[PDB]
Design a protein around this ligand. Structure first.
Ligand SMILES: CC(=O)N[C@@H]1[C@@H](O[C@@H]2O[C@H](CO)[C@H](O)[C@H](O[C@]3(C(=O)O)C[C@H](O)[C@@H](NC(C)=O)[C@H]([C@H](O)[C@H](O)CO)O3)[C@H]2O)[C@H](O)[C@@H](CO[C@]2(C(=O)O)C[C@H](O)[C@@H](NC(C)=O)[C@H]([C@H](O)[C@H](O)CO)O2)O[C@H]1O
Ligand SMILES: CC(=O)N[C@@H]1[C@@H](O[C@@H]2O[C@H](CO)[C@H](O)[C@H](O[C@]3(C(=O)O)C[C@H](O)[C@@H](NC(C)=O)[C@H]([C@H](O)[C@H](O)CO)O3)[C@H]2O)[C@H](O)[C@@H](CO[C@]2(C(=O)O)C[C@H](O)[C@@H](NC(C)=O)[C@H]([C@H](O)[C@H](O)CO)O2)O[C@H]1O
Ligand SMILES: CC(=O)N[C@@H]1[C@@H](O[C@@H]2O[C@H](CO)[C@H](O)[C@H](O[C@]3(C(=O)O)C[C@H](O)[C@@H](NC(C)=O)[C@H]([C@H](O)[C@H](O)CO)O3)[C@H]2O)[C@H](O)[C@@H](CO[C@]2(C(=O)O)C[C@H](O)[C@@H](NC(C)=O)[C@H]([C@H](O)[C@H](O)CO)O2)O[C@H]1O
Ligand SMILES: CC(=O)N[C@@H]1[C@@H](O[C@@H]2O[C@H](CO)[C@H](O)[C@H](O[C@]3(C(=O)O)C[C@H](O)[C@@H](NC(C)=O)[C@H]([C@H](O)[C@H](O)CO)O3)[C@H]2O)[C@H](O)[C@@H](CO[C@]2(C(=O)O)C[C@H](O)[C@@H](NC(C)=O)[C@H]([C@H](O)[C@H](O)CO)O2)O[C@H]1O
Ligand SMILES: CC(=O)N[C@@H]1[C@@H](O[C@@H]2O[C@H](CO)[C@H](O)[C@H](O[C@]3(C(=O)O)C[C@H](O)[C@@H](NC(C)=O)[C@H]([C@H](O)[C@H](O)CO)O3)[C@H]2O)[C@H](O)[C@@H](CO[C@]2(C(=O)O)C[C@H](O)[C@@H](NC(C)=O)[C@H]([C@H](O)[C@H](O)CO)O2)O[C@H]1O
Lengths: 285, 285, 289, 285, 285
């Protein structure tokens, strides 16, 4: 009925918790699992390939980090759907954490060494551009497309890009804000983060939080604790409401790149994110 | 009547919301739209040209980032204007956000490579000087001119500079604070940000927020969330009042520069800003 | 099993304070103590050894920093565990501090010099990647394994790795989150920090706080004061409970590396951490099986 | 007579506002105004000159940034001065802002270029050591002298140094805290900031706020908004009192240095600071 | 007697304020005062001398920064010493400030120049590792020894080191936390800061605040204002109590190093710290 938020439902089972972890989608898929057939790159992207000229930029799909997303089912609520007043799940808060930064302390590998003159020192740790965004909502995250170069030739299959949505080539307006270029995060590991951003004009039922730090050798920084709670309630004390009984989790956590000893080839590094959402039942008209 | 702030108007349609996005004005105009005739630079400036001597500094108009601005209409109020007490629109708060920082993760292009020796590594991402300013008011943003060099030879057409206002050449005082060098942000993409700054001596009906980070290769930093509200009310609980039912939005969001493989040519990069303003009617004398 | 938390116990000895310091476990064990037989590296790791190829990475055990931990005995409370209502120790807060950052001001040693042309300047101070984590709980810290490379050939004896737990080689999923790879921090100086991380899915009775800063030459940063208290109480005002009356302290505090004059060999530097835990007795409905 | 603070005066004209802007004093005076005779350096210092030996360091006065200051008249108060209870002006708060950071976005000049191999790239922007201090009080800001080198041969004319005050050469104690080396900020553009610092042992009637960031190429950082109020009231709710009915404003705002294409000559850059002070009348014994 | 904290004493002279400044102890003593015989280094350390081998590290005493400290007398209290309830001085808060950062703006000296090829640019300002610690208490600051190298050969006279206390050579445990290595800061300019740290296991009657930033060329950062009060009261509202009517002040403020033109010789630079402590009388059992 009319989306008028009423009281908080009380009684047995009116509150619940949902846990989930989303693994990064940096480029290399989970399979093959073989550590000699490509599996060794899981959690990373494959070697970043550069444009050959100002008009020929064709990045490989497996070199492009994409959004991670999961749709989780919540326990049922309404029997009589035609009642004037119904119940709905409401996301109150979430404890989220990026796991694994300690693994970046491995500086004993075969990356580009710190002393390139003599090929000594330590294996250079992951550094560079970082990007962390997470969202919790009752609908898929609304995306707004914006790219560095509208001339970039993305593969037509394997990834969802602006052309996939509009059925036409990107225009110059796509390098700034073009209202026509919109989509929804409805698939895991398919929407490149260099193209799709959270849409501030929509997302009425989703709360998203993002931050970016660029550069080429910028030190990665991360905090992690099980004592930090992120409030999802808006200024009116109402959190995201699940209209379809399915909760949406979205995220991307890029730590930077590792660099090889062969022509400075860069590989993106991503880390998994944990979510623990507290939900409660809400009376809605 | 007299400028005395009274009570908040109550009743149907006493509160409203206005949304809008302002695209950056880095130098290259929206047209030509062709990706081979200049449109590929939309969202960026054209290649920055340098002075030829200590007395010959003539920057091209399309290399100078300018302020973005928009004037939005508000629904009408006053039936009888000659009344002792009238209603005025008052800006309470704004949810603003710079969209597209994820696009800076595109490091597969044709920019100056990180490994110049072998022309390998990755396409160097946008880095350098950053500038973010946004304002909301009931009048155009009041500007105060101040430049690096009063001898700079800006074009007389295509841009609004100190000379445009005073009808005379800049004087040495224009390198510090000269009360004579003032203007108002009344046109989009015309007032250069290296010349025009928010005037703290005026702007009684505007709230502006700005920050600057300089340097040549400083890592760009940006946060974005749909949960942050910017309060526009002053110390007395009063926000900007629309004296003429036209809301003014002003902004500039420079992320740094990208560098080409041809003589380190720099191109400024800017991103669009979204605004969602909450307004309420106010009884005024 | 019905962990129902009730009132705070009042009266004589209802509140207590535990103190302890945990020394870093960077690689070189406390012994031999001799300053010419290896003891001179205590507080540091031994020289970090690098992989010989993309498929041959065998780090030495003494080059891998591991978690520090201690289990402290609390005064006994319940002689009989069959009582409907019992008392349990609850951790309220902790004053913790990493000690010794001032020692990093020693730049008169024999590390790689800042003027390499003349072998002059100062002895380069410790810089680079930093990692600081501490935890207090009523059970061992729950760990989730995740590594940079599942092909890394860790020694089988001397350290507890994913293989030690699963009895099988690591799989590609171990480079991301693989639920199967879990363990508990039950031994000091045995679990490598580049492998084991606090498990957010568990640790229901432990509070952990960690931060990481990477890079190769990043300046080390640290604050220390005896005026800062870390609250251990959760959103409901209930801190970690000790069901077995053994309190667990865990930590790792890496300041970065020092670099020698011989082929830029790096040595991890760690510093000791102090803990002062405030505890109180809590009445609880019998949670014992 | 006695400084016993009583009630706040109420009634017509019991509160007032004072606005003022202080231009920077980096070295080059406001005149000559000619852009070919030296006026082109206004807002900057002249080229920094280095010591010729460990015992011969004599900086030119026009290369040393000095404190900016102004004394402003407040409206009159007492008719009868021989009364037991009088009224004094009290500074409650101040809105202050450093104007012009946007001008630092001019990277198209003739400074040392970022690409020295080809003399290309961009004109290196201002970078380095930054110093920001402002004060508001009822008496001149009390100064404590402390220098890098007690052997520095500061000019005897045109500047106020420690020797000017003591009538004797500096001693080694002047490199640390020497209680004898004190002065008052009673003149604009005369007291070098590398010599004179706010005295924490005095200034009972002044509030000062300062910060320093060193380095040679450190990125300049600055925030500016018309929504930030600095409270001037002390722990007992009392702000600075004007006993002589003359308000003192002091400041210095160094953004760093620009470097020329000739032997890396450095020129300090300063920016003007705006002040809007709110004052109220106070009953005093 | 019984260390029970009761009410605050009221009446005439029940509250007092103590002021003092502590000069830095970087290595060079205050004497000789001569600016040619060594006094020119006052406020700095003498040139840092390096180890000659992995087993021969003998730093000169004048190259080691030590703790600054002062014991201040407070006004008398108790007449009848054998009373059940006595009065003790309690430190409530302290306004502390590091003075002189502006002196670091002197870049016109004879330090290693920024353009070493041509011996041009500016005299490199102080940079590098920074250490700031201050304490206020009713007893000497309790110290815990911890060094980088237990093999370091510190001079036996002129400095108080671990061996001074234990009468035996340092052991490997001294590189971590060895409970045996403890001392008290009872002398000014004698305890090296690279050896002695605040002891968290003691100092029940002292409040200490410290921070450290390492690196070789890290920009020095510092804030200073007379508006910041540091609370010395613990969680129970009780501040440090002066048991033997002697207040202790301790500190160290290292800003970094300046580098000479001769073999990159480094000299530590320290700055003085000001203290203004507010104390009140307390009734104690
Ligand atoms: C397996 C293989 O060789 N595939 C070819 C593609 O190359 C691979 O592309 C990947 C990204 O898509 C990675 O860059 C691969 O690099 C790594 C990797 O696997 O991650 C980097 C690792 O560090 C390295 N590991 C080690 C230990 O060294 C591995 C390792 O060497 C190999 O896995 C085993 O040998 O390699 C990289 O090998 C190649 O991209 C594609 C397609 O090539 C095209 C394209 O479509 O992009 C063909 C087009 O016709 C051409 N277009 C034009 C106009 O010329 C483009 C163009 O050159 C390119 O866009 C420029 O960048 O190339 O072919 C596969 O066969
Ligand atoms: C097309 C062309 O060459 N036009 C001339 C102008 O040059 C262009 O100026 C732009 C800014 O106004 C950009 O700098 C252009 O550079 C880019 C660009 O288009 O953005 C940089 C891109 O990275 C590059 N792209 C690629 C893929 O390489 C493109 C690309 O090369 C071209 O678009 C393809 O053709 O180029 C740049 O080309 C030039 O500025 C003007 C005016 O020149 C004058 C002036 O009036 O300023 C003439 C004066 O007589 C002279 N005065 C004196 C005293 O010497 C000044 C002086 O040299 C200058 O002020 C110093 O900077 O130059 O002429 C157009 O014809
Ligand atoms: C005592 C000795 O030489 N042991 C050999 C190992 O060397 C030692 O390894 C340590 C790490 O485990 C440190 O790197 C040692 O370096 C230091 C140190 O003691 O910490 C660095 C100090 O800075 C230095 N001090 C000074 C003042 O200079 C000291 C000092 O030189 C010595 O303490 C006294 O001389 O040295 C370092 O000495 C060495 O790592 C192993 C290697 O053996 C193997 C292996 O890893 O098992 C054998 C394998 O068969 C081989 N595998 C393959 C496929 O080749 C691997 C492979 O090379 C390796 O994985 C590559 O990294 O090496 O041998 C010990 O005998
Ligand atoms: C006109 C002239 O050359 N005068 C000499 C002085 O030089 C000027 O000093 C200024 C600072 O006081 C600036 O550094 C001037 O540099 C600039 C400038 O004007 O700002 C830098 C600009 O970037 C540059 N502009 C351009 C576009 O290039 C301009 C420009 O070149 C000129 O303005 C054009 O004319 O120049 C700089 O020219 C110089 O300072 C004095 C030094 O004299 C003494 C002194 O300190 O009084 C004499 C003493 O006896 C001597 N002591 C000893 C023991 O030798 C000291 C000592 O050498 C000095 O302290 C070492 O640093 O110098 O001489 C004038 O002739
Ligand atoms: C005057 C002189 O040469 N004295 C010798 C001592 O050298 C002095 O040591 C100081 C630190 O204790 C500084 O490093 C001195 O450097 C400066 C300074 O005075 O601060 C640096 C200044 O920048 C510079 N000023 C200028 C304008 O250039 C001044 C200036 O040059 C002079 O002041 C003017 O003459 O110099 C530095 O001069 C030296 O420390 C002592 C003792 O030497 C010993 C020791 O440590 O006891 C002797 C031992 O026998 C030896 N041990 C071994 C095993 O050989 C050690 C060993 O070499 C050392 O441990 C390695 O670091 O040295 O001798 C004086 O003669």
């Amino acid at each position: 009925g009319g989306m008028e938020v009423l009281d908080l439902v009380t009684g047995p089972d009116s509150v619940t918790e949902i846990e989930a972890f989303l693994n990064p989608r940096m480029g290399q898929p989970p399979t093959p699992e073989s550590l000699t057939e490509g599996g060794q790159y899981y959690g990373w992207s494959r070697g970043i390939n550069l444009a050959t000229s100002d008009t020929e930029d064709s990045p490989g799909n497996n070199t492009l980090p994409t959004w991670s997303m999961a749709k989780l089912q919540l326990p049922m609520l309404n029997e009589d759907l035609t009642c004037d007043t119904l119940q709905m799940w409401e996301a109150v808060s979430v404890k989220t954490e990026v796991v694994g930064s300690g693994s970046l302390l491995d500086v004993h590998g075969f990356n580009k060494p710190t002393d390139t003159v003599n090929t000594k020192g330590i294996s250079t740790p992951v550094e560079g551009s970082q990007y962390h965004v997470f969202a919790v909502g009752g609908e898929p995250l609304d995306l707004q497309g914006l790219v560095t170069d509208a001339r970039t030739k993305y593969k037509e299959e394997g990834v969802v890009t602006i052309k996939t949505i509009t059925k036409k080539d990107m225009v110059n307006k796509d390098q700034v804000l073009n209202p026509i270029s919109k989509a929804k995060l409805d698939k895991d590991g398919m929407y490149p983060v260099e193209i799709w951003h959270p849409d501030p004009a929509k997302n009425e039922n989703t709360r998203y939080f993002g931050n970016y730090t660029g550069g080429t050798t910028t030190p990665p920084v991360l905090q992690f604790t099980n004592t930090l709670t992120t409030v999802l309630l808006d200024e009116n004390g109402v959190g995201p409401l699940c209209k379809g009984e399915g909760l949406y989790l979205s995220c991307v956590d890029i730590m930077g790149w590792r660099v090889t000893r062969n022509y400075d080839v860069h590989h993106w590094r991503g880390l998994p994110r944990y979510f623990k959402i507290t939900l409660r039942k809400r009376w809605v008209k």
